[PDB]
C-alpha cells in the first residue's frame, strides 16, 4: 500500500484559458452541441468516479502520512497514538508564540509536523 | 549476467584453493569504526581501506597457481592481455564469443 495517484494534473475548466471572466474551477459543460462535452479527440478530460484513488491511500501525502490540522497544543496531544499515519498540520493563523509550543511538544511526542518552520527562526 | 561466456579452450583451475573464497571474504567492510565526537570536526580521522597484503598474497598464490597454468596454452597469456572490443560491422549474434 504505497501512495500512488491515478493522475497528477488538475482538471481545468473548458475554455478557462481563453477568458479571464471564466474561472479555472471545474464546471461541467452543459452545452447542447458541445463537442468537448462529447468526448472528442484533442479535447480535455472530465472528472469521473473512475479517477478515484485507493481507499487505503486517499488523503495520504506522498510520504504516506495523512494531514491532520492542529489548532492549539491540545490538538497535537491526541495524535499520540497515530503518529505513524498522521502529520500535525499547523493552522495558518496560529501565532508564532503557540507555534513553537506546538512544535516542541510534537517533537517529543514523536509525531511529524508538516509546517514546523513557519514564522519562526532557530538560534544556536 | 555482466559476463560473456567465451568458448576459449578451458584452463585447469583445479589447482587453486577455491573454498576459502566466500561471501564473507568478498563482503564489503562493515560501516564500522566509531570516532569520538571531536575528530569528526576538522576532518582529522580519515583512514584508508588500502588493500591488505594477504588479499594480494591470496591472489599471488592464485597467480602462482594459474600463471603457470596459462602459459602452457599458446597465445593464452597474450589473449588475456589483449582488450576486447568491436570493430565496424560487428554483429554479436552472428560471431559467437
Amino acid at each position: 500500500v504505497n501512495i500512488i495517484k491515478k493522475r497528477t494534473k488538475p482538471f481545468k475548466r473548458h475554455q478557462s484559458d481563453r477568458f479571464k471572466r471564466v474561472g479555472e474551477s471545474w464546471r461541467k459543460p452543459r452545452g447542447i452541441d458541445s463537442c468537448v462535452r462529447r468526448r472528442f479527440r484533442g479535447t480535455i478530460s472530465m472528472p469521473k468516479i473512475g479517477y478515484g484513488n485507493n481507499k487505503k491511500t486517499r488523503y495520504c501525502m506522498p510520504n504516506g502520512l495523512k494531514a491532520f490540522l492542529v489548532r492549539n497544543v491540545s490538538d497535537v496531544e491526541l495524535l499520540l497514538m497515530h503518529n505513524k499515519t498522521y502529520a500535525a498540520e499547523i493552522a495558518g493563523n496560529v501565532s508564532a508564540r503557540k507555534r513553537v509550543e506546538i512544535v516542541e511538544k510534537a517533537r517529543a511526542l514523536g509525531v511529524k509536523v508538516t509546517n514546523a518552520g513557519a514564522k519562526v527562526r532557530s538560534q544556536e | 549476467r555482466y559476463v560473456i561466456a567465451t568458448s576459449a579452450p578451458k584452463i585447469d583451475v583445479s589447482g587453486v584453493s577455491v573454498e576459502k573464497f566466500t561471501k564473507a571474504y568478498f563482503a564489503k567492510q562493515k560501516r564500522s569504526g566509531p570516532v569520538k565526537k571531536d575528530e569528526a570536526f576538522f576532518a582529522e580521522n580519515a583512514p584508508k581501506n588500502a588493500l591488505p597484503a594477504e588479499r594480494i598474497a591470496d591472489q599471488k598464490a592464485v597467480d602462482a597457481k594459474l600463471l603457470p597454468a596459462i602459459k602452457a596454452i599458446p597465445n593464452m597469456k597474450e589473449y588475456l592481455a589483449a582488450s576486447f572490443a568491436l570493430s565496424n560491422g560487428d554483429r554479436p549474434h552472428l560471431m559467437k564469443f
Binding site: - | A85, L86, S87
Partner: protein, 106 residues
Amino acid sequence: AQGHRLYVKAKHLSFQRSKHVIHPGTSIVKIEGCDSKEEAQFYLGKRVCYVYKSSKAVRGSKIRVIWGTIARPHGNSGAVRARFVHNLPAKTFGSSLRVMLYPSNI
C-alpha cells in the same frame, strides 16, 4: 582510437503509434545487423541507453544518460521496442542509441 565500443550502435526511429495516435511510452529502435524478427530475439532484454550532452556541468561532468530496456521485436526488419526510464524526447528521432550487451544471456 581502435578499441572501446563494447556495445552495438542503434538508431531511434519513432514511437509506437497508429496512423494518427502516438503512444510515447515505447519507442522503435533499429539495431545494426538486425534484419529479422527471429534475429531480434538475441537483443531482447539488453540495456539500451540514450547519451547526450548539455551545457550545465553536473557532478563535474557534462553527460546525461537515459537508460532503457529492449522488450519485444517490431516487424520483420529487425526493429525492436524499447522502454526507457524517461520517455525519449520527440526531438531525438533519428539519433544514436547504444545497446550494451548486458544483461547477457550468452
